Amino acid sequence: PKYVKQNTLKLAT
Amino acid sequence: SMKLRVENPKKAQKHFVQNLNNVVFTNKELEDIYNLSNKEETKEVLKLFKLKVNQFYRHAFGIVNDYNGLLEYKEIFNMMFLKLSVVFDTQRKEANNVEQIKRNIAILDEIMAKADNDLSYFISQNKNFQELWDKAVKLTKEMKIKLKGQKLDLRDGEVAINKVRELFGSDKNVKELWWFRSLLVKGVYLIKRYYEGDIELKTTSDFAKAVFED
């Protein structure tokens, strides 16, 4: 089993 | 169809960081970091570190040089430097910890590997880019023959473009896509070198490899 993450998104501009 | 740097790429996610404009560290910047490693005992590994930072840069630009036609390349390029920036965080507080400097070097490698994977992944998901990138190789290979006995004085960097316009200047893709036309312009300089007996060509780039490989 592999824990999967949520990618961080870059803020506005 | 098109060969990837990693055959079966593992899922990659974009962080929408393609519009960053100053991710690349300047020399003064990198030097100010190298300077922290002032102790004697650490001067040998400090070399290996400087050497890796250089390999790193070459790797990153190498990707933009071969795949600037692929929209997601800025994402991959920028992510590489955003990660480097984190490693440097540790480097700055561990400036003379040889074991740490070695881990960091190992990570700089991992960052590069991850870049190749992610790049392969995005390419795999863009069949259209693949068709175009393959076609570019296709014509450059034809050009390899077409220019068999011609005079290639590329000294002023003017003939290359002309030749591309002469042999394929009517190809929809050569008129419309700058990156595509550039792969061909880039290609004639390679063919020229091939004729002069250059033997390293295949190691020059994925493009050069795909072109001069059988």
Binding site: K2, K5, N7 | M79, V86
Partner: protein, 180 residues
């Protein structure tokens, strides 16, 4: 009626340049990624024998986080965070009994930013061998919790105390313990 909560929490703090990537289950840490070594470390060894995580992924996230922190700081016109001092408390693992192995737990709660200096003392002497600590745990109010541990052998002639230093404090907070 909710039964469980799994939280993926990460943070980046300036000018310290310190980040954290961690997974939280019902309040307890499952694991976190050591940023310096870039590798997954589980809260209980057992956990690693049943699950895994690509530390490299955390690196990616903390990389972006850093860039965001800059963007936000500026966009907020450089508004600094308001220090909120921790609430320190100290208790044992289980009831104390002379010479019977036990553990001292220092609970550092409700504070920010996530920077704090902790020191264990035994009759005025800083103790180390045996100590351990959890990374910064997240709170629903966006403050943090942290635990420090000191295994010890109870005795009618020792006075320990957990010393906590944080910007939100006027002077080092010093909670005492000695079977009482």
């Amino acid at each position: 009626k909710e039964e469980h909560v799994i939280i993926q929490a990460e943070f980046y703090l300036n000018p310290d340049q310190s980040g954290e990537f961690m997974f939280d289950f019902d309040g307890d840490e499952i694991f976190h990624v050591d940023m310096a070594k870039k590798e997954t470390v589980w809260r209980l060894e057992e956990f690693g024998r049943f699950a895994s995580f690509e530390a490299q992924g955390a690196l990616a996230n903390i990389a972006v986080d850093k860039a965001n922190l800059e963007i936000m700081t500026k966009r907020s016109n450089y508004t600094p965070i308001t220090n909120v001092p921790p609430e320190v408390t100290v208790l044992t693992n289980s009831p104390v009994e002379l010479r019977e192995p036990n553990v001292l737990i220092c609970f550092i709660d409700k504070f920010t930013p996530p920077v704090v200096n902790v020191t264990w003392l035994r009759n005025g002497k800083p103790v180390t061998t045996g100590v351990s600590e959890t990374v910064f745990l997240p709170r629903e109010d966006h403050l943090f919790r942290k635990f420090h541990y000191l295994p010890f052998l109870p005795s009618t002639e020792d006075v320990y105390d957990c010393r906590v230093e944080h910007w939100g404090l006027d002077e080092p907070l010093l909670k005492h313990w000695e079977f009482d």
